[PDB]
Design a protein around this ligand. Structure first.
Ligand SMILES: CC(C)=CCC/C(C)=C/CSP(=O)(O)OP(=O)(O)O
Ligand SMILES: CC(C)=CCC/C(C)=C/CSP(=O)(O)OP(=O)(O)O
Ligand code: DMA
Ligand code: DMA
Ligand SMILES: [Mg+2]
Ligand SMILES: [Mg+2]
Lengths: 214, 209
């Protein structure tokens, strides 16, 4: 069993490239993420993680925050009935409206589905570690790997990670408990990603020899 | 002005097979190459050169392999400690004490006045790092701050550039906790085959971003 994590990038550059508004670029992002969820399910992944946002992203203007959060929420609105939906992250920086709607969508999702779509919002290792410490500070004799794993934003090690958009860096999106995650970078903007691009990415990722330090 | 470079040295086994030599000789070439690389980083104006010596999982290899690798890195310090400031950090409880003792003696003897620092991180693992920080501050502070976290991470400052030769596009337990804005560069050349020109074009790529 294998899981896949996507870092969606390139909506502004795609808006300028297509000569359309940012809102329409985010609508194309919604469609593209629905496609991508279907592809990941067809490819046998048990969980498809989508990095929705870092903490820094919520420092953009409220118009961009609203447009983006609505675009991501629309993915769940369209797909939630046929899969298990979940979410995590630094929820205190997300506007409460979207926390409410995503909570309702998770309650309405198919908890018995063998495929999971998982949104991570407000990713930042510093905020994650600080939150875990402040949660357990003075309440346990010591932190164990089991408890840490049980409270990380990503609830399991990530097998494959894909970042389109041309930037070779992880920003605030590195998954805490995935020391041997395989990373794949490609210059294609997310909204230009085809099924064939996804497939050759999976060829690259699956062809690699995983050795785990041994 | 603080500028940092982090190298993930990889490919010693494949290089030993490629050259038809023992693992020990491949690690000797790694020692020579890392002395070169430290020199290159100093010439390029980096204030600290971080080298990831090992992950926690690496110490589950056979004792001969651990001895070979730890001796090769320690030999880097043996050759360089007189002309630079040396430091080290990480999950020290899993490092064999022989190497902790020798590396501690070498760090105490290093050139504290050098404006260039070589820093080894040993037993890297984000889980062990976070667990150690928590257990240190558990119940003793009202809340964890970014300052305390930054002051207690294995890598004590933000990393500017991160380079991994050897062809694998992954962090392999070596991701620096407090470097959200680090730029990454991967190249297929094995570490022992890296030239100064390869390093220079790597720096062109990283600096053009
Ligand atoms: C959900 C919120 C508040 C923000 C998400 C923003 C987001 C997905 C950013 C990645 S795409 P973006 O950086 O806007 O477009 P490019 O500059 O990379 O072309
Ligand atoms: C064994 C210890 C403690 C440290 C050595 C880890 C290290 C420097 C690995 C880089 S080269 P290695 O992974 O051993 O050989 P390859 O399979 O990558 O060719
Ligand atoms: C994959 C993803 C959601 C990235 C967040 O946006 P960004 O990193 O492109 O924004 P910034 O310009 O702050 O780096
Ligand atoms: C010290 C160092 C940079 C080792 C390279 O990583 P690795 O070979 O232990 O990781 P993997 O087994 O995933 O290739
Ligand atoms: Mg972007
Ligand atoms: Mg290796």
């Amino acid at each position: 069993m294998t899981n896949l994590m996507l870092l969606p990038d390139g909506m502004r550059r795609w808006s300028q490239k297509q000569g359309i508004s940012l809102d329409d670029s985010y609508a194309a992002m919604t469609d593209k993420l629905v496609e991508f969820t279907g592809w990941a399910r067809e490819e046998g992944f048990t969980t498809f993680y989508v990095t929705v946002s870092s903490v820094a992203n919520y420092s953009r203007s409220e118009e961009q925050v609203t447009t983006a959060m609505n675009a991501f929420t629309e993915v769940v609105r369209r797909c939630h009935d046929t899969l298990n939906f979940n979410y995590s992250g630094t929820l205190e920086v997300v506007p409460e409206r979207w926390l409410t709607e995503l909570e309702a969508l998770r309650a309405k999702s198919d908890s018995q589905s063998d495929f999971t779509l998982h949104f991570i919002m407000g990713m930042s290792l510093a905020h994650e570690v600080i939150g875990i410490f402040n949660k357990f500070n003075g309440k346990i004799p010591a932190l164990t790997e089991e408890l840490l794993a049980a409270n990380a934003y990503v609830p399991e090690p990530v097998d494959f990670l894909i970042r389109p958009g041309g930037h070779v860096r992880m920003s605030s999106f590195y998954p805490l408990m995935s020391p041997f995650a395989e990373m794949y970078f490609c210059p294609t903007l997310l909204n230009d990603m085809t099924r064939a691009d996804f497939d050759v990415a999976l060829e690259d990722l699956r062809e690699r020899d995983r050795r785990y330090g041994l």
